[PDB]
Amino acid sequence: DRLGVLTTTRRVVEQAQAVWIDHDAVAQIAEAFAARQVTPPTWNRELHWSDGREALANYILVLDAVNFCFWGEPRWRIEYAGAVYDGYWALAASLKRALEQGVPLTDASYLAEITRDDVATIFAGEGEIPLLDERARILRETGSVLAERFAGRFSDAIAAAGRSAVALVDIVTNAFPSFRDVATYRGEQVRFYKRAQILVSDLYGAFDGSDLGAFDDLGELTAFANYKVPQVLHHLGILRYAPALHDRLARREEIPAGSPEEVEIRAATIWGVEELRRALASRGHALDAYQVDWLLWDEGQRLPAGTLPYHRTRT
Numbered sequence: 001d002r003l004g005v006l007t008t009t010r011r012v013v014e015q016a017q018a019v020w021i022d023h024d025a026v027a028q029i030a031e032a033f034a035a036r037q038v039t040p041p042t043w044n045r046e047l048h049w050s051d052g053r054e055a056l057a058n059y060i061l062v063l064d065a066v067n068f069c070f071w072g073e074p075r076w077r078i079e080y081a082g083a084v085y086d087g088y089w090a091l092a093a094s095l096k097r098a099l100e101q102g103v104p105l106t107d108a109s110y111l112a113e114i115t116r117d118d119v120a121t122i123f124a125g126e127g128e129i130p131l132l133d134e135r136a137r138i139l140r141e142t143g144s145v146l147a148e149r150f151a152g153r154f155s156d157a158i159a160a161a162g163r164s165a166v167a168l169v170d171i172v173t174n175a176f177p178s179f180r181d182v183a184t185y186r187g188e189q190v191r192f193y194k195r196a197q198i199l200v201s202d203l204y205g206a207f208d209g210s211d212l213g214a215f216d217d218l219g220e221l222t223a224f225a226n227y228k229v230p231q232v233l234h235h236l237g238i239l240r241y242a243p244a245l246h247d248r249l250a251r252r253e254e255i256p257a258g259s260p261e262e263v264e265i266r267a268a269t270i271w272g273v274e275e276l277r278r279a280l281a282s283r284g285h286a287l288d289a290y291q292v293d294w295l296l297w298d299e300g301q302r303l304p305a306g307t308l309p310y311h312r313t314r315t
């Protein structure tokens with residue numbers, strides 16, 4: 001466990017007061033999923049950009065640099081190619097739209113200088129993308145780090161990882177401040193690395209596990225601790241919430257980042273996915289943790305009306 005995600009999150013799950021795993025539900029869900037050999041959907045080619053290897057690598061870094069927090073009222077929505085999108089697909093569509101119209105979002109020099117008005121345009125739609133100013137700041141940071149340390153080419157970073165997913169995550173968090181996703185729980189560091197790990201899985205997807213998307217150790221990735229997958233796990237009965245936390249989610253009350261409740265959700269998400277992975281493998285359906293994450297995130301796109309709302313964090 002070379003990044004320390006499973007180890008540090010396990011300490012949280014063992015001590016967690018507001019969240020816990022129902023291991024019976026894990027078994028039952030594993031039974032049904034294994035029975036019908038459920039598979040994550042293939043990496044989406046419609047709403048993701050495609051290009052030569054240098055531009056594509058840079059595109060994946062930018063996509064995942066700003067891959068966070070899409071909730072808020074009035075709901076942020078995007079119109080692209082005769083369809084309306086929200087959440088992640090709104091992000092994806094927005095970038096694809098910008099690149100098609102020839103915005104140089106894969107060029108480090110442009111990213112280093114990108115303005116608030118640039119990103120407001122790129123993500124123009126109904127409402128406004130949350131944390132707009134932050135996204136502008138992250139893209140400027142991303143650009144100037146690319147330019148300074150990687151000759152403007154994320155492919156330089158990828159090459160230095162030598163086909164290790166774990167090594168690339170560590171290269172990314174070392175160089176790019178925005179990707180440093182750790183917190184504390186009762187005085188101990190907890191390590192998550194959501195966006196850094198999702199980046200690696202997205203290279204694998206975009207490059208079909210060849211060239212720059214070749215990795216020999218993808219099993220070492222964890223789930224990407226977000227707000228949608230815990231909502232799915234709660235829906236499937238795998239995550240249970242204590243009274244005050246349940247009521248907070250129901251009221252759509254925001255939870256401060258790094259607070260005990262929030263850290264417990266994220267840790268239990270990691271271990272909820274890991275426990276489902278082990279239970280599936282037990283029943284002869286071997287998937288990597290990132291695949292179980294993909295599969296659950298996909299289920300999260302068509303949850304029934306009146307499932308408990310996902311938790312709302314911000315920072």
Ligand SMILES: Nc1nc2c(c(CN[C@H]3C=C[C@H](O)[C@@H]3O)cn2[C@@H]2O[C@H](COP(=O)(O)O)[C@@H](O)[C@H]2O)c(=O)[nH]1
Pocket residue numbers: 040041042043044067068069070086087088089198202205223224225226227228229293294297300301
């Ligand atoms: N754990 C996990 N979290 C994911 C993703 C994705 C998209 N990945 C694509 C690439 C390969 C897969 O097959 C997917 O097609 C976005 N997110 C996070 O979810 C939230 C937005 O959710 P919603 O409102 O539904 O759009 C937000 O925190 C966002 O950062 C997934 O991979 N796993």
